[PDB]
Amino acid sequence: SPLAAYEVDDSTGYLTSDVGGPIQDQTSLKAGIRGPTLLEDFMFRQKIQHFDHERVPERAVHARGAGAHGTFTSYADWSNITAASFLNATGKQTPVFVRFSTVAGSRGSADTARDVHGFATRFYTDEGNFDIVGANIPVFFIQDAIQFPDLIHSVKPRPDNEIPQAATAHDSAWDFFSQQPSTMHTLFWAMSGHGIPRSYRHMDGFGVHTFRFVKDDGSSKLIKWHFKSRQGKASLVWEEAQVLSGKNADFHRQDLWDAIESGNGPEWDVCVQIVDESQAQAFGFDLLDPTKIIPEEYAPLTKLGLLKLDRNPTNYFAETEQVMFQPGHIVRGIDFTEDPLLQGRLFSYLDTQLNRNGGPNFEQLPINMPRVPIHNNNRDGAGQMFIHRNKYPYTPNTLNSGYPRQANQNAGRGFFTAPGRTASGALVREVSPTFNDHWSQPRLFFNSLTPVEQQFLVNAMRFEISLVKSEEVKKNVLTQLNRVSHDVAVRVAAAIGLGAPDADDTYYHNNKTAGVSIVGSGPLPTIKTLRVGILATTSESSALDQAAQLRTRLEKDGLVVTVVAETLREGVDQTYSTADATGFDGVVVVDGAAALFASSPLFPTGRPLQIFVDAYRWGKPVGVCGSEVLDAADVPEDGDGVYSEESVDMFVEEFEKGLATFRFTDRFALD
Amino acid sequence: SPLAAYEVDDSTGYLTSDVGGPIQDQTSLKAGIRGPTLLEDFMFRQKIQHFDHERVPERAVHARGAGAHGTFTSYADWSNITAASFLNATGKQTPVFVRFSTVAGSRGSADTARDVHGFATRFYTDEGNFDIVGANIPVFFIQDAIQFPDLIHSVKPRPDNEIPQAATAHDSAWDFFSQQPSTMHTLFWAMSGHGIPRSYRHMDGFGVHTFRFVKDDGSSKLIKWHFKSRQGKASLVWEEAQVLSGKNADFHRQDLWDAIESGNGPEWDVCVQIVDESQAQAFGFDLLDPTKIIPEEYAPLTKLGLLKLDRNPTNYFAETEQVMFQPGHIVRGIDFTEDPLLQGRLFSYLDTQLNRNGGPNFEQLPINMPRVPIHNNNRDGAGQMFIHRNKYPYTPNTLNSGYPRQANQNAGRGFFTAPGRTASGALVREVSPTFNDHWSQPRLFFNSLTPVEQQFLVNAMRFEISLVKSEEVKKNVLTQLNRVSHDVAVRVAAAIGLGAPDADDTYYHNNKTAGVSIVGSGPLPTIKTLRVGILATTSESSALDQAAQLRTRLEKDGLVVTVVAETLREGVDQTYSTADATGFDGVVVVDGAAALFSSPLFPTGRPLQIFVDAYRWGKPVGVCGGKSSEVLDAADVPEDGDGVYSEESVDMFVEEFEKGLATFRFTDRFALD
Amino acid sequence: TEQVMFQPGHIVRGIDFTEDPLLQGRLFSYLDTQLNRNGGPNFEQLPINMPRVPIHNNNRDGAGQMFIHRNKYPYTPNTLNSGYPRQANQNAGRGFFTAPGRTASGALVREVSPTFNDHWSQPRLFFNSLTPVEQQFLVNAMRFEISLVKSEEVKKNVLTQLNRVSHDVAVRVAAAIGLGAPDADDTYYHNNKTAGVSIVGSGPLPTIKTLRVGILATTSESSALDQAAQLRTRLEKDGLVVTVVAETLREGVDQTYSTADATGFDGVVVVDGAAALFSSPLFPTGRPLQIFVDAYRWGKPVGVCGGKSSEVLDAADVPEDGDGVYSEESVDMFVEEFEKGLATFRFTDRFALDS
Ligand code: HDD
């Protein structure tokens, strides 16, 4: 609503200055037709000054990201467990804005870099903005917010030459991981398929930290936020993600945009794990430690409501660039814990927005405004957009009749700290001994991946560690890996021509936990929005008909279908020149096109076959609809996820189960 | 190092605050061991506040770029054409700093996006900092500075969703180009190989605008700045640039950094075309028009001196991120012309630094300081570093004895505007009709490309234009292209399924100019720094020995060799898992490795695909050891192809392969329309 | 008030600039300086700076961007937003336009035009147009300021300049600083005068509404408060702002002597029942009288109301027959005479002139 009021329409009218004076902006005012430009040309200077000043500093982390508006709907009245107003009635709807992001890249870096991902959600509640500034991955790299700049420095480009962009595949990062063992758990997650998700819709969201739900009577329980995707979980393979980074840097933002535009907005079940205060240390680790999960085995999820994203921004800069999230945006009914990572975060987000906005009034930007009235004594500052009528902005006052009133546990639905919370002991800069096990949970995570998933994770480490220059850092990395799993270290060391150190089983175990594997999560529950590339030819009128018949049959099941040929024409969406296997979730070759797969000026040599071959190498469902063609490709007709049918209807029935399975993992060699 | 004075050493010592108090920075102060963090913890807040404020706004354009220090050395005493002090004596040396960049992409975007490129040079002269803020391409898109935000909005990502990053391949850019025909010239350079240069070192530099050289006697001449690369000109191919963008987004900055570190700092001859004032309209077009070149046939280059980059920065943020160039940094001996694109630039560069630096004292940053005393009455402002002794900072004064003194043509070596310059006429926002021909010079450019270069250009157009959604915009684009060359409009039209409109020959001609063709500038004058990848194997003790012998021989000639194998060990630099054809200018397979041409250690087909990509992208490729037919047949590479090598002898192999590296690209391998 | 960001560059169709070199440069400064003040480029979006008509342009982004722009093709020329916003000029859209008869000719110069070289005749025109008393005030101001310049070469330099405007000003100013003026230099002397530049000579004020009347009274005498109340009623029905001062505050009393001062009023009236005040823990010694003497010495109308006036006038050393000095028994006849003095505003005959 603050959003609609500030929309500006330029679909009609004459050019004006920012003060409403009609003007032109196509030619400079000059002293003669071939003369120098004039200082008094105010039209020139106001336009160029605005241009000179368009940029604002990028976020210190999560600079590359994309957002969408939507709705959260509560499933019940949750007053039994929380005082939160947005959760207080069945069907109660609250508007949201979500931004998704990578962590390390600058603002024009590729969506498909291997990274941890941000998932930040704002609830515009009727008791104030509430932000959950969360992740695709449930655990964080470090145990104390004071270490955040050390971690970020080491993962961001080397500061002498600023290389490499958006990547942990360099000496400093692995130096840091190998010296700071708290990093192991998140490192394993970022090195698994979670670090290269197929889209934002296909990842979960986590609050990471333990928070509190606080009832109106003052009792509290400990919670973890889990946003469970209704789209299913899916990842790219590394070799594909790299190619994508170069063919389409905007892949996730495009995906999110197109999904919303076509009536396929993504959905998540907003859940919590709920446990009592007395369980803080009961699960074999400390719930204040943000490098640990509570296994679903020990605490099941409760579904609180539905998060849907269904409307794209009108102006990316005003909305997605300017949105300023804060864990300090909290509402009555939620409270913090003494998690030292969370504690420090609270300071940074208030402070960093002065850098981004250049002024203290950043909560006045329409995207940051609340949906309820604002009553407070904050005044002045650069960019002040309000005109305050209260001329006695101090408490206590009589001159404004004691208004605004103080709000607290008793009065005005005020936020209040959980009254059971205590502190005791020395004032210390000490790490709690309860935080010292850095290795068991990464091992638990590794144990829970499938063999092929475990191979991708080894291969991700082999790829990155093989890029570290320093022999010493490489040894130190094997030393830490070895403490999670001797086998991982052995397999990683084989690729870099070092010996692993000897097994040190202090942290080894064989336990698994549910819901952390991508492959093990079964086929996608929907295939709407998946992309099919039909490779075809303009040489053969049969090929274009086979393509058009396939199209209409695939399009009904909500697939995004692209017909590729040599040149554009009615029915053909893309040329071979611009097509790549990374553009598709499945590739079908119509047999009418068999000639193309054996040279042309309209595209690079071998392109049509390379699309098909890349798709197959990368685990994707591939088919031919009419063969011989499977041989030019070296693709075995009998392989799973390879479809050969003469029939159009049976091709599609079969191929769609492919899309659902999504990736065919038997095509990947194991150690 | 020229900025040694401002360096901070942290190779020893205990951590301190910014005010010198020794502290720790690894654990927050808590009320109890599992307690909440205390507001009184200043160590935490100073450290996080700094981090929270590390970012500054990126440049409005040319956000993505990289820089290095060097030296300029004058070849002569140039007082016969200019009063400029940095050009006044043979062998006079002046510290420079240069920054290269793309134009449209944000920080983080890929070096090998197709784009125009920035080439910005600072000369820290004994008479003030002088900046030439130039380009890799000699002509700009538009003829009046006021249109810059229109050009930049149309080519930058669409503002509802911010897509696509660093790319002109979308409707808004082509709408602009088709509606604004001044764009055609620059557009044809961008669509050629100049849009995707092999490295910063393989591109030329241009001032773009006509400037003036001014002598101490007040006479002047019109100049164009040309920086001619001593490394030769080389481009990538589009299909390769795209893969590189994703395999190494840092490709040009790394190429530059490594070149300087290995003692191969890149060089340019800094040159000018000089012409008389009265030739402003003599060459068939207006010298005030930044969309036009003076063909070299009409005004030859004079070499003024040598530009050499030979030192990397110590801190990228402090040096490269913060360097703030301005065409307003001008020195006596040089002046502006009435080019309306230049005239307006003067305003923007001074203003935009307030944005980046967040305060008025940006010239006090070390990278922006001059190398001579500053005497002026500028005072205060946020971030003021100086402590000025003169308490009477106004002119005229007697209380500081009339100092600082006024500098001008006749006293103090003052800057002065060329005394012969005049203005006459009405005060107008009109375009000179001498600027109206937008098409003859893009046609001149197209004609001077070899037939394969012309095919690449057409293919870059087909690639981008086929991605424009709007059929109207696509039609409007063929209309403009058609005014340049009917042939280009036909061939592009074919890719997108639309008829080219009827020939319109007002601007067609057959004229050619020297020195704009990359593929026709002969073989590279040097191969030092070029990258050779040797594919090899650990299965065979003999493949690693062929690789070692081959390494030794190639490295002798200053080439950068990478041995690739399944796994690293002594003498192996990279695994197949990380290697790609984009990492090399030439690929050799040692014939001990024939068998590789499936494993858990690299994706299926990777070794063969490296060789096949290298061949398909025009690179010299070969097989060394003497048995070649098994590698070559697996790859479908004919043994007698130009740029395909097979020899038993290491010595003989290398001599032939080095000729291929100089040819650089084997253009016989790409189809023509 | 603090955020309002004025610009001479905020101009509308029908007005234009001239080549005044002072004006010309100002045009650059005000656009640039609001970046400093606002800390970001969107300062026209502050409420006080907003226009009252629709804004249609392709300016975007920047810190503090309050607008959410619909148009996703903010470039000209475009087809994808149908060529909107349209260009405004002389012939379409009521565009601003530079005055079409303006031209420039000549060298590009950093030179002062010689037409600007007479710096002295107009200051002399101005000085000649002030009354004798106004002349003394101007001379006194210079004597005040130049007497605080430490540099004896600066004072000499100042006399040289003043001398070219008026020898007499130079001589009169030099007398206050013990320096001799230099010899008359009459290149720019003249006798012309001009209307409209004198304050003391622009007549009595055309209105006295809002002028401030201090009524000095006492709580010792309840008839002094009655006299003050009576005086209040008849002054306020003419729109004067009236303040009754006494030792302490009570009904009818606005200010205490402790906070009262002659700078707080345009006229001072003492009610004759308060004559005794003219020492206490409640205000500084001599305060009630000093209020009266100050107002008198600054040329304000002053008076005593009620009929016994000589105790007050004598203590103040104010002559009963002086212009601007009123003494009447009747409140009504008092107010009528006093209100004429308020309009005269200043009684210039209380200040000495150089011979
Ligand atoms: C004390 C430093 C610090 C620490 C320990 C963290 N962060 Fe943070 N975070 C920031 C300091 C920060 C920041 C510098 O303040 C950012 C940059 C821009 C902004 O709004 O805040 C930020 C941005 C940011 C964003 C982008 C918000 C958006 O899209 O606009 C997300 C999703 C996260 N963070 C999430 C996390 C998670 C899940 C953490 C660990 C559990 C975490 N942060 C720890």
Ligand code: HDD
């Ligand atoms: C009226 C505005 C305007 C116009 C018409 C131009 N530019 Fe510009 N240019 C800018 C306004 C600008 C800017 C917004 O002021 C930048 C961004 C940051 C900065 O320092 O200046 C800039 C940056 C910039 C850089 C980056 C310098 C660096 O590495 O920091 C280069 C090389 C150029 N420009 C070169 C050109 C060339 C060759 C042009 C046409 C001949 C041109 N510009 C026209």
Ligand SMILES: [Ca+2]
């Ligand atoms: Ca590093």
Ligand SMILES: [Ca+2]
């Ligand atoms: Ca577009």
Ligand SMILES: [Ca+2]
């Ligand atoms: Ca600021």
